[PDB]
Amino acid sequence: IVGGKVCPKGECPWQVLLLVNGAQLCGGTLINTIWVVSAAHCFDKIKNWRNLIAVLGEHDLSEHDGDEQSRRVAQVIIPSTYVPGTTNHDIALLRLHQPVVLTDHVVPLCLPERTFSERTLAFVRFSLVSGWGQLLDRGATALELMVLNVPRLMTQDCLQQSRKVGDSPNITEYMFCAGYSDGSKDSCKGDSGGPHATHYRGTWYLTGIVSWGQGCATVGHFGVYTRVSQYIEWLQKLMRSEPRPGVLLRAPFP
Amino acid sequence: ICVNENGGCEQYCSDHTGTKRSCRCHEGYSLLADGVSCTPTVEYPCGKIPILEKR
């Protein structure tokens, strides 16, 4: 996270840290005790599928304080429409091997209903983005969880407000822009998979996933987020389904 | 309505046959008698921050 602040310990209790062989891989969002939403691109280069760990109740990476709960990731579910190495349909649904135990430091974020998310949540201007990603473009990653307040913009407005770059990916209906074009504040490469959480009438909801951008906090550019409202039914159907053998599952989308 | 100011609902809104509207809540919550408010039914409902709620 570029230009944010430390999230006070316990104020982002749905934040997940994904690890592969103990190394920081991506962020994620706890949506109940056994399900985590992350980004599909996080798993493009994984060969050691049994070394995939989700950490809940995490805050400071230099110390173990006892509120951290780690679980083996039993399944990684990605839409059939996602193509590795590309940007579209950047979502993953993770089933933990055992449930996490809800505490003051481990709480799920609400996965909203599609209609509520499109008709109401899409119009809340500001939302929070978080992670242990890069503190600057070409900088070091954070030891303490960082949080940033970003405004959402309409795609027409994002495209016209952005510097025209060659071979730049399209912003599809499965994405949204959020952030600042002045080069001061953004989510970054290591924040990938993390929550874009929206407040509405005293409750927080999952509206986006840290997905991509052109560098971090690049002048004339905004952060690009997976538009979670497009996957509510896809996510709900999968959470009601029985586990299948194998870690990686490709599931039809829509 | 549900299109207009979330049908007055704190959480979810369902439109019905005519000028009828039913508010609903996410699991771990119950709808109050006002028909719009959602109250937690569990210790750790989704989207609430315990250290902030306890302060």
Ligand SMILES: CCOc1cc([C@@H](Nc2ccc3cnccc3c2)C(=O)NS(=O)(=O)c2cccc(S(N)(=O)=O)c2)ccc1OC(C)C
């Ligand atoms: C779908 C993912 O697309 C991309 C993701 C990133 C980056 N994540 C970022 C990067 C910049 C950001 C700026 N603001 C807000 C959020 C941000 C999040 C990331 O994952 N880098 S990475 O090297 O770990 C990585 C891993 C898998 C896939 C890709 S790839 N092949 O899509 O470039 C890159 C960069 C470029 C991407 O590609 C497009 C073609 C511009």
Ligand SMILES: [Ca+2]
């Ligand atoms: Ca720690």
